[PDB]
Amino acid sequence: AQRQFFGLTYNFYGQPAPLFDLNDLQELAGCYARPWTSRFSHLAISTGSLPVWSARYPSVASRNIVVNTLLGAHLNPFAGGQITSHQGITWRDPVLSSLAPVPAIQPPPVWAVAENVLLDSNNYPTYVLNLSSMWPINQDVHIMTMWALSDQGPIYHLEVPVDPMPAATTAALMAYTGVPIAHLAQTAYRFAGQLPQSPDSTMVSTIRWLSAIWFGSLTGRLNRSRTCNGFYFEFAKPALNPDQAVLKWNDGARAAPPAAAQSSYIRCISPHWQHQIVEVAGALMSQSVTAVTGLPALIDEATLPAWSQGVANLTGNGQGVVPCLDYNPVPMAAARHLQWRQDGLITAAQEAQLNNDYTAYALTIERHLTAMLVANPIAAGRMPIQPFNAADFGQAGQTAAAVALAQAMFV
Amino acid sequence: PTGKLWRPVGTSVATIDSLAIVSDRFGQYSFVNEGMRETFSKALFDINMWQPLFQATKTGCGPIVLSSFTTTTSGYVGATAGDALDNPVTNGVFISTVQIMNLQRTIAARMRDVALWQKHLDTAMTMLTPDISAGSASCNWKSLLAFAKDILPLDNLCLTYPNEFYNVAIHRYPALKPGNPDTKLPDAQAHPLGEVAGAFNAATSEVGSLVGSSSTLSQAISTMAGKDLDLIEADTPLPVSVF
Amino acid sequence: PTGKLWRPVGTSVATIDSLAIVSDRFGQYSFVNEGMRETFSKALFDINMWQPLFQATKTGCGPIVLSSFTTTTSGYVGATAGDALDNPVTNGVFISTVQIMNLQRTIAARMRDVALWQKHLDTAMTMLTPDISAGSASCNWKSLLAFAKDILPLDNLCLTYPNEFYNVAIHRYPALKPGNPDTKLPDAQAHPLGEVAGAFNAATSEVGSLVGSSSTLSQAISTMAGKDLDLIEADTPLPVSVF
Amino acid sequence: NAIRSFLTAWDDIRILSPDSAVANGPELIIEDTGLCTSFMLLDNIPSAHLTKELIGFTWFMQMYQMTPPLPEGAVNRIVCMTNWASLGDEGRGLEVRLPPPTDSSVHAYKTVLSRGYIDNAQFNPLALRSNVLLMLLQFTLSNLKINKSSTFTSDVTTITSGRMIRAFEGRPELLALAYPGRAVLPTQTKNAQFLSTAIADRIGRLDRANLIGGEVSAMVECMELCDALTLHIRETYIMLLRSMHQDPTQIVQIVNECANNLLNSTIPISLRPTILCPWFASSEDLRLQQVMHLVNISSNTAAALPLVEALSTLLRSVTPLVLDPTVLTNAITTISDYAAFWKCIASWAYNGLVTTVLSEDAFPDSSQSITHLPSMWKCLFLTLAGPMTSDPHSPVKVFMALANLLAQPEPIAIGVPGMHQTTPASQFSHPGVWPPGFLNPQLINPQQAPLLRAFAEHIRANWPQPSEFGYGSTLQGSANLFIPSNRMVYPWPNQPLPRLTVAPTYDSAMSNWISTTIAFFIRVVNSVNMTATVNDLTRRTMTGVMTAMRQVKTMTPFYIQHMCPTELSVLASVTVTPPFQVPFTRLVQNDVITNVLVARVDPAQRGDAAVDIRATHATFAAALPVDPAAIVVAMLCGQTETNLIPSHHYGKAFAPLFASNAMFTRNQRAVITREAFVCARSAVAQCQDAGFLVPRPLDALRQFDVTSAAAAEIMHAVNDAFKTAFDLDGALLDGLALYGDPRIADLSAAYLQYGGNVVREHVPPGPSHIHRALQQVESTFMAEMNLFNVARGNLYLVQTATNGNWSPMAPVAAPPFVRGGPNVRVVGRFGTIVPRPNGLEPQLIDDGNVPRDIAGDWVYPSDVLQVSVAVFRDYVWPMVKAGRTRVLVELGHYVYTLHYYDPQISLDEAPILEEWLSKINPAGIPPVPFCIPIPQVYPCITARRVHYAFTSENNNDSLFSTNAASIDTAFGENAAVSPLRWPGLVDPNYRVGTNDLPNRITLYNSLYRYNFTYPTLDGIMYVRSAT
Amino acid sequence: VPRPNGLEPQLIDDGNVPRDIAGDWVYPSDVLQVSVAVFRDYVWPMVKA
């Protein structure tokens, strides 16, 4: 299958120890203190449209943002070989399941707190000699890596071949029809995180084809009148829950396979991704693919945070790197509505209408995060919000280039 | 459309100020309107022609397709945000600055390459006026060849590659008609790459020469408007500059 | 694309060798790129104009549509197998050699035909300067006509076909505005076939004349690059040839 | 059942889910874990008992014999048989079982027009395309099932060891068939040789674990054998389902909105890798379902009435309003059940399918005076109740009633030609007939006709102003035609339920109407004219009573303007049949919908103009008579229950409604009507030569032009097939095949407004998954008809006495003689033999019309042969048995039936043939009878036998293989196992999921075994709470 | 609204954004009337604690 994941631990943002305390270990949903196979656990049972977030976890990406620093704080293996222990907490045994208090009689060595520790994976020989059991850990660490190599939104990866969708892909995809993007992220992740799959498996090339097929919809290029291969995502009114996507199937005028491969990493600069279940789902839904199949190439050092500068085997700067086109939710959806008007889906009156109904919605996202960062600073201890600063929220980077990527990805 | 391509910049709806020249690591994509492709194609076309001489002499590097310097971006393409807003082009064909550099220095480097050979081919071609302007007139090929085998000075390049120059030549002189391989006879018609242009320059017996009579007119029209021949006997003060 | 059209002689798979100029009983189809249709259309357009004089005098043979010399083949069209491989054109419009011959000798034969009449129309037209360059100025039509009824020498062709030349004329001189049949009055606007061209030559009072000032510049630009005025006081050995 | 219970939070009581039938749901989920095939390899001629040689494998001592994966024996064909390896719970009673080519496959080709005259032993060649379309439509429907993934078991059988095959508990016999190549005994025999080249890898399942919920995988990738055609049909139905899948989570919002927040719930739903809730139908579809009910109801008012009472119940059984005249009676009495009413509000919800007019009895005979008291009262009741109806012509009929009564005191001229002030009010029921005086009060004079200029003045400025309101959820799908999406149109102006007070309860639209009218009539019963017959005392007693009514404290006017909209808005969402509703119009004349009609094709392209029967009825919708006298009472006495928190009340009521998943039955019956339509319209549009654009893969099959009457049967066969497959209730699609042209193009409903304007809602059915598959199937039927016994090409009848080799099917020798060839004469119509007097021999009548003689060779278009078999069998047939003549009957296709014999038993074929000629007649031909020799394994001296038939095309494609049990074959037409059928199992360049479909039905494919769970919501439901 | 794998049942607060029971609530009496069945089953066990 695959066994060689190069990771990278979360940044401290200038804080002493990793941003999380003792209580985070016995609060995680699902399997006790087991951080593995968590993420989409608090969403296992849907009650309604309202995004699941409590007091300690003020947002959607709050559950994951916490399991990240909690994850890295206990990742001496792959980066040292030992098991160590942070604040009296360690793994049960070599398989690395749930975290229990440091066992007596033979306690592990105390972990040396460090920021951004490069994970080699092969450094821990027990991993490959017990792959079929500790496989989820590979998918999860990969997630933490994509989240760590960015101070503003998880950097996933789109692709799309030069030729049309395989004959085994079109038959597998016709099963995730009436399924929201929020759920596609849950089924995608829970798939690549329980049993060692192959890089050329049917469910892998289809889930990847489902992610890049989602980006076009998010940009508006793959609407109701322009399918990639009969699949798209119908968006509801932004004032009436814009989180709803669903992979609808039609028989309209399909697009056409591009002249070349459109491999490209994408990011969401705007801190809006934090509270948007749709953005967090789109990110983690793509990460499920780069898990079973390590990074197709290296990531561009063009922008990114000041700590992801020249990583071991993650972010480069030469010619073997792939540019990262980052966008912004508000301008992206503002350009997404503009696509619908061009082909005649919406009236020229609903053009400037959907913009005001969405910008008001995205405002609620901004009014929420700003009010949560102040409530939960950073020097306090944890980092459920991630210090984004209020100077941003609307400084859209090359979002205009991400849109031009979708037009090129589906000619 | 024309000019550099722009794309929406920053938060907001597309608008006259949302736009910004889509520049980047390659320079700025400038749109390649229909006619401007005619030139770069007409320029590259005149180079590809010399294909048989590029391989023979191991220079060159394969045929130059203009589709190797362009791209298929899409956005609004104008001269300024304001006016670029009225030219939404989808998957247009733009050439990035750094590319507008190669298509330039390539056509320049190759242009030297051929300009040289093309000069040898000539001292040998015109060295037997392959151009008449009334009726026809042949000259049994054997003789012709066995003749230039002489005249041509020892430092040409038509003696080092005869049928490596000949193949280039056949496409420039509808006088030399190569003998077809599977009937071992000429063709009546001559098919030089300049098929049309060469057809429209022949001194057509009905009227001198369209290419001539056409220009001698546009030429005169230029002057007539230019110097200011019009107004030649105008009765009123005129700045000497006007002369 | 440009050049002659090629097609996979080896069938299906078209590689840089399984191609071959698609020649045949008609000669070789050469592609008719967008701009090259502008010319042959602009040439035929100037002939169709003389339609009323072709029928009157039983010459001609109906209006010449450029769509009678072309075809709708499809294949790869380049200058050489190698580069033609990057121009897959479907149902492009090509003109076969033997056709590139007629569109030629037709435009030539017709060109004579009109060149003659067109000369008579003129000695009569310019024979009353139908062109001013500031404000307007009329000349009651009756007089005008009854006048040229005189001057014009007995061997013109504007006396044998008045309103057979007049109809040709109306399309060349936005001075002569024909009186509309169902209101029996002029039109204010004048609609000569050269609608745009004639609009862009008028001596616009803001700036002399775009057609003039434009050329007087491109003309100078030619020289500046040509002779080599640039480098005029260069301090270093220069072959006399450079002069 | 989407929803099962609903423990209401405030009440804590689990509401469990339950001429017009009760709409039940379509059986959308059937599934079988057995082999996904419908093309078995049934062997035909049994094997001549060879001596095994290599027996089963020998593990240690034991000797394991395994069942031969492929059919062995003489000749094994590919006999089509739907769900032959089906191992699931059930199957939609409807299949296709064709007997091996050795039997009369004729029966399966006798649906459409065959029934009745055709002998059970012959099919109708004329109605073949029509009968093959219906035959495949049953081969599709039959195969519309899901493939449960069963339980695998790691195979440890050497060559295939390591591969995870599938169990097959139902009947272990399958495990043999399922995976050909798994444990192949080296016994070199056609069969075994082939199965040997099988790729060990292809067998079993492909993918690894995958989305393992619990311990079972969400959807595996079995590899088992499964005819590409069947695998493709199901891969279509899986999509049909997913298509209409409904995100379970959104279900809370749908209920929250559809009920207007009055009722708010929560429904936990465990999201899983698999899950499937076929409860959602797009508005795109729901409209083809709407105009559909519009067709079944048709002019028939009796079928439309069931709909307005269905609502008249729900309405009343949920309203806070309780009507009771006690108060009214008291008030009036001093100085001296309401179906009508409820069948007037429920009447508006369908204003457009059934209007509510005023019973003619109400009107006071135009010849009666106004001095006549009983008459002027029958008039006052006809006004107070007017607006209460949904007749676009009430505002006039009302005004007119009074224009009648006082015809002498106020003799005003009526504009409408041919009509006079004394014309029975009822009579006015067309926007044209409207009096100009009424259209413009100004026309009447104040002193000329005081009362009228005052009465028209009244109506012009008092009749309630129509209005509207949204309703249902937005994530639902309009389902309504003329009025904007999920949003109704109400008669009176409505407003959000204001906190009860003295203000809203006297200011309602209706309060004004009830008021100003009584006010107006009080001045009428006090006219000077009244004196003539009205007493001074009784004239006062009249003012006494009419004032009691006016001042009576009725609380309905408030209900019908604040609380009644919130009911319909909701009630209009929990109904299996959404509200059809054409826009309301008060006095705007030219625009007041005159006619409403469904069109089975846009008038433009409609050959044979046929209006919608509805046109015949006066009013545009089924005119349901409502009595004014009743409605007025109801309107004048509606006190509500003392304690009344609108919040708690409406809450408790709409609770039981959302418990019955009747909202989802609507979405389901909908996505099936759109299937049964895109499939019906297609099948009838494929049998007519011209007509609606539908891919005709079966255009080659001979089929006469289907008339209007004929279609209705190809239509009943299609519509009736769907119902049987999805066991539905009531109409569905038969409305189309019961009148008008069954030949529908694209349905559209349009109403024309008197203002000479026709708004026309086109409703094109969005891509029918079922139909997309059917097309692919019809397309396959061409390249593979032999697998259905039908054969393409002409039948030659040249007598051949060879004792050598034969194969009527795919004959190697060159066609005896082409049709337009040298010397062949086409037999002219009728094919009439002309006896010739004297020595001369009988000669056949030529096509060129000039009689030629028989000896030679003719080309018989089957049409001719069928209208003179008697003459054929007695003149040309004998001339054929004797090697003198060679006929060439021409049948595009047909049902062949062959009989295998012993190449060693010399037997003439003539008898076995005439058995045939004998049954041919105009009404229909019996299966063509070929006689093929059973492939002999050992060189055997064959016996001379004379054959007569054989085709022009090669039709032995059906033949799967001969002598699988032998190292080869010595005599009969030998046929090795073709690798082509199994590109998946054999070829190394296969590509999971790759078909061939249009051209060649592959056997061993790569299906995708699913494992869906069907979440069944049952949540808590909290009301709103007083405040 | 209940929450999956061991998470506090959120009590839909006023603004209509489910909040959590362990805190300080203000129960508009009317609400408490059409809701006790719930109150007693999730917030009550909480107040006692």
Hey, of B34, B164, B195, which one would you mutate to test binding to chain C, going by the most C CBs within 10 A of its CB? B195
Return the residue matching tokens 């083809």.
D288
CA distance A45 to chain E (A): 5
Query: Is E33 in contact with D1025 (Cβ distance < 8 A)?
Result: yes
Task: Please tell me the total number of residues recorded for chain E in this structure.
Answer: 49
- Residues in chain D closer than 8 A to A250 (CB atoms): 766-767
Q: Which of B96, B20, B79 is nearest to A396 (CA)?
A: B20
Query: Is A29 in contact with E1 (Cβ distance < 8 A)?
Result: no
DSSP codes joined into one string, D721-745 = HHHHHHT--S-TTGGGGSSS-S--S
Q: Which of D283, D281, D307 is nearest to D294 (CA)?
A: D307
Query: Is D207 in contact with A203 (Cβ distance < 8 A)?
Result: yes
Q: Which of A60, A92, A59, A86 is nearest to A73 (CA)?
A: A86
Structural tokens at position D90: 């059930």
Hey, of A403, A405, A409, which one would you mutate to test binding to chain B, going by the most B CBs within 10 A of its CB? A403
Q: Where are the beta strands (DSSP E) in chain C?
A: 5-6, 23-24, 27-28, 30-31, 75-77, 88-89, 94-95
Q: How far is CA D516 from CA D382, D789, D980, in A?
A: 14, 81, 87
- Residues in chain C closer than 8 A to B42 (CB atoms): 2
Q: Are D914 and D929 in contact (CB under 8 A)?
A: no
Buried/exposed D970-1009: b ≥16 CB within 10 Å, e otherwise: ebbbbbebeeebbbbbbeeebebbbbbbeebbbbbbbbbb
- Residues in chain E closer than 8 A to D647 (CB atoms): 34
D1013 touches chain A (CB under 8 A): no
| Angle at CA of residue D370, ends D367 and D371, nearest 5° | 115
Q: Which residues contact A221 (CB under 8 A, 6 or more apart)?
A: A255, A339, A406, A407, A409, A410
Query: Is E34 in contact with D1023 (Cβ distance < 8 A)?
Result: yes
Collapsing DSSP to helix, strand or coil, C199 comes out as: helix
Structural tokens at position D707: 């008339």
Q: Which of B42, B214, B176, B210 is nearest to C103 (CA)?
A: B210
Collapsing DSSP to helix, strand or coil, D552 comes out as: coil
E28 touches chain A (CB under 8 A): no
Chain Cα centroid distance, residue D702: 27
Distance between CA A281 and CA B94 in Å, rounded? 35
Q: How far is CA D495 from CA D510, D554, D570, in A?
A: 13, 18, 15
Distance between CA D694 and CA D906 in Å, rounded? 52
B30-31 and D356-358 beta bridge pairing: unpaired
Distance between CA C5 and CA B193 in Å, rounded? 11
Q: Are C190 and C175 in contact (CB under 8 A)?
A: yes
CB-nearest to D1022 from E28, E30, E34 is E34
Distance between CA D712 and CA D737 in Å, rounded? 5
Helices C97-125, C34-48: axis angle to 10 degrees equals: 40
Collapsing DSSP to helix, strand or coil, B23 comes out as: strand
Helices A399-409, A202-219: axis angle to 10 degrees equals: 120
Class of residue D941 by CB neighbours under 10 A (exposed 0-12, middle 13-18, buried 19+)? exposed
Q: Entry resolution in angstroms? A: 3.3
- Residues in chain D closer than 8 A to A194 (CB atoms): 209, 211-212
Q: Are D937 and D50 in contact (CB under 8 A)?
A: yes
Element (H, E) at E11: strand E10-11
E23 touches chain A (CB under 8 A): yes
- Whether D14 is in a domain gets the answer no
- Residues in chain A closer than 8 A to E2 (CB atoms): 45, 47
| Phi and psi, residue E20, nearest 5° | -105, 140
DSSP A139: H
Structural tokens at position D926: 């019996």
Chain Cα centroid distance, residue B73: 26
**Nearest residue on chain B to A395, alpha-carbon basis:** B10
Q: Which residues contact A159 (CB under 8 A, 6 or more apart)?
A: A208, A212, A261, A262, A263, A264, A296
Tell me the count of B-C CB pairs closer than 8 A.
Answer: 109
Q: Which of D737, D891, D741 is nearest to D128 (CA)?
A: D891
Return the residue matching tokens 């919920």.
D213
Helices and strands (H, E) in chain D, number of each type: 26, 23
Helices D128-142, D769-783: axis angle to 10 degrees equals: 120
Query: Is A29 in contact with E4 (Cβ distance < 8 A)?
Result: yes
Q: Which of D272, D214, D219 is nearest to D248 (CA)?
A: D272
Distance between CA D801 and CA D908 in Å, rounded? 8
Query: Is E8 in contact with A42 (Cβ distance < 8 A)?
Result: no
Q: How far is CA D355 from CA B42, D278, D343, D426, D666, in A?
A: 75, 35, 10, 15, 24
Task: Based on the fold, state whether residues A356 and A213 are members of the same structural domain.
Answer: no
How crowded is residue D812: how many other Cβ atoms within 10 Å of its Cβ? 8
| Phi and psi, residue D525, nearest 5° | -75, 0
Largest CA distance in chain A: 74
How crowded is residue D347: how many other Cβ atoms within 10 Å of its Cβ? 28
Q: Which of A403, A254, A248, A230 is nearest to A333 (CA)?
A: A403
Touching subunits of D (3+ CB pairs, under 8 Å) are A, E
Hey, of A27, A54, A62, which one would you mutate to test binding to chain E, going by the most E CBs within 10 A of its CB? A54
Helices in D434-584 by DSSP H: which ranges? 436-439, 450-460, 509-524, 536-551, 556-558, 565-571
Expressed in percent and rounded to 5, the helix, strand and coil fractions of chain D are 30, 10, 55
Touching subunits of E (3+ CB pairs, under 8 Å) are A, D
Element (H, E) at D192: helix D190-196
End-to-end CA distance of chain C: 38
**Nearest residue on chain A to E22, alpha-carbon basis:** A55
Collapsing DSSP to helix, strand or coil, D54 comes out as: coil
CB-nearest to C28 from B38, B191, B221 is B191
Distance between CA D1008 and CA D238 in Å, rounded? 10
Q: Are A34 and A28 in contact (CB under 8 A)?
A: yes
**Nearest residue on chain D to A235, alpha-carbon basis:** D475
* Residue span of the structural domain in which D655 resides: 23-1027
Distance between CA D732 and CA D24 in Å, rounded? 11
**Nearest residue on chain E to D263, alpha-carbon basis:** E34
**Nearest residue on chain A to E12, alpha-carbon basis:** A50
Q: Are D947 and D931 in contact (CB under 8 A)?
A: yes
Q: How far is CA A399 from CA A273, B3, D725, in A?
A: 14, 22, 51
Distance between CA D950 and CA D794 in Å, rounded? 9
Q: How many domains does chain A have?
A: 2
DSSP D108: G
Return the residue matching tokens 């409403």.
D596
Q: How many domains does chain D have?
A: 1
Cα R_g (chain D), whole angstroms: 38
DSSP codes joined into one string, D342-360 = HHHHTTTTTTTTS-EEE-G
Element (H, E) at B99: helix B97-125
End-to-end CA distance of chain E: 20
Query: Is C215 in contact with B226 (Cβ distance < 8 A)?
Result: yes
Distance between CA A212 and CA A405 in Å, rounded? 11
Distance between CA A202 and CA A214 in Å, rounded? 18
E20 touches chain A (CB under 8 A): yes
- Residues in chain B closer than 8 A to A362 (CB atoms): none
Structural tokens at position D482: 């003329």
Q: Are B69 and B102 in contact (CB under 8 A)?
A: yes
CA distance D1025 to chain E (A): 5
* Residue span of the structural domain in which A366 resides: 328-380
Distance between CA D885 and CA A386 in Å, rounded? 97
Q: Which of D693, D748, D749, D742 is nearest to D718 (CA)?
A: D742
Distance between CA A302 and CA A321 in Å, rounded? 10
Largest CA distance in chain D: 127
Task: Please tell me the total number of residues recorded for chain A in this structure.
Answer: 411
Structural tokens at position D762: 């086109």
| Phi and psi, residue D598, nearest 5° | -100, 140
Q: Are D289 and D479 in contact (CB under 8 A)?
A: yes
Distance between CA A54 and CA E7 in Å, rounded? 9
- Residues in chain D closer than 8 A to E38 (CB atoms): 9, 1020, 1022
Q: How far is CA D438 from CA C221, D457, D466, D699, in A?
A: 84, 8, 19, 61
Collapsing DSSP to helix, strand or coil, A319 comes out as: coil
Helices A329-343, A351-375: axis angle to 10 degrees equals: 170
Query: Is A46 in contact with D253 (Cβ distance < 8 A)?
Result: no
Amino acid, single-letter form, for residue D372: H
Q: Are D30 and D38 in contact (CB under 8 A)?
A: no
D356-358 and D624-626 beta bridge pairing: parallel
Task: Based on the fold, state whether residues A400 and A288 are members of the same structural domain.
Answer: yes
Structural tokens at position D77: 């064909």
CB-nearest to D235 from A171, A183, A246 is A171
Question: Left (φ > 0), alpha (ψ -120 to 50) or beta: where does A63 sit?
Answer: alpha
Largest CA distance in chain E: 32
CB-nearest to C219 from B51, B210, B222 is B222
CA distance A326 to chain B (A): 12
Structural tokens at position D516: 């100003």
Return the residue matching tokens 């939960």.
A376
Q: Which residues contact A135 (CB under 8 A, 6 or more apart)?
A: A193, A194, A195, A196
Return the residue matching tokens 């090697």.
D883
Q: Are D1002 and D983 in contact (CB under 8 A)?
A: yes
Chain Cα centroid distance, residue D701: 25
Query: Is E38 in contact with D9 (Cβ distance < 8 A)?
Result: yes
CA distance A52 to chain E (A): 8
Task: Based on the fold, state whether residues A319 and A391 are members of the same structural domain.
Answer: yes
Q: Are A291 and A146 in contact (CB under 8 A)?
A: no
Q: Which residues contact C222 (CB under 8 A, 6 or more apart)?
A: none
- Residues in chain C closer than 8 A to B49 (CB atoms): 79-80
Distance between CA B125 and CA B127 in Å, rounded? 5
A50 touches chain E (CB under 8 A): yes
Element (H, E) at D174: helix D174-178
Collapsing DSSP to helix, strand or coil, B54 comes out as: helix
Structural tokens at position D887: 């006929």
Query: Is A46 in contact with D248 (Cβ distance < 8 A)?
Result: yes
Distance between CA D983 and CA C79 in Å, rounded? 43
Q: Which of A29, A61, A69 is nearest to A280 (CA)?
A: A61
| Angle at CA of residue B30, ends B27 and B31, nearest 5° | 150
Q: Which of A302, A303, A298, A308 is nearest to A269 (CA)?
A: A303
CB-nearest to A54 from E2, E4, E10 is E10
Q: Are D343 and D626 in contact (CB under 8 A)?
A: yes
- Residues in chain B closer than 8 A to C66 (CB atoms): none
| Phi and psi, residue D1004, nearest 5° | -80, 95
Q: Which residues contact D927 (CB under 8 A, 6 or more apart)?
A: D104, D105, D106, D122, D123, D789, D894, D895, D896, D897
Query: Is E5 in contact with A44 (Cβ distance < 8 A)?
Result: yes
**Nearest residue on chain E to A31, alpha-carbon basis:** E5
Class of residue D641 by CB neighbours under 10 A (exposed 0-12, middle 13-18, buried 19+)? exposed
Distance between CA D765 and CA D736 in Å, rounded? 15
Collapsing DSSP to helix, strand or coil, B207 comes out as: coil
Distance between CA A245 and CA A231 in Å, rounded? 12
Distance between CA D346 and CA D969 in Å, rounded? 79
DSSP codes joined into one string, A179-212 = --HHHHHHHHHTTTTSS---TT-HHHHHHHHHHH
Q: Are D6 and D267 in contact (CB under 8 A)?
A: no
Distance between CA D878 and CA D561 in Å, rounded? 91
C19 touches chain B (CB under 8 A): no
Q: Which of A41, A69, A30, A157 is nearest to A382 (CA)?
A: A69
Chain Cα centroid distance, residue B90: 28
Bridge partner list, D951: D795
Q: Are A141 and A4 in contact (CB under 8 A)?
A: no
Q: Are D89 and D31 in contact (CB under 8 A)?
A: yes
Task: Based on the fold, state whether residues A185 and A266 are members of the same structural domain.
Answer: yes
Query: Is D993 in contact with A170 (Cβ distance < 8 A)?
Result: yes
CA distance A194 to chain D (A): 8
Q: Are C82 and B48 in contact (CB under 8 A)?
A: yes
Hey, of A41, A47, A62, A186, which one would you mutate to test binding to chain E, going by the most E CBs within 10 A of its CB? A47
A250 touches chain D (CB under 8 A): yes
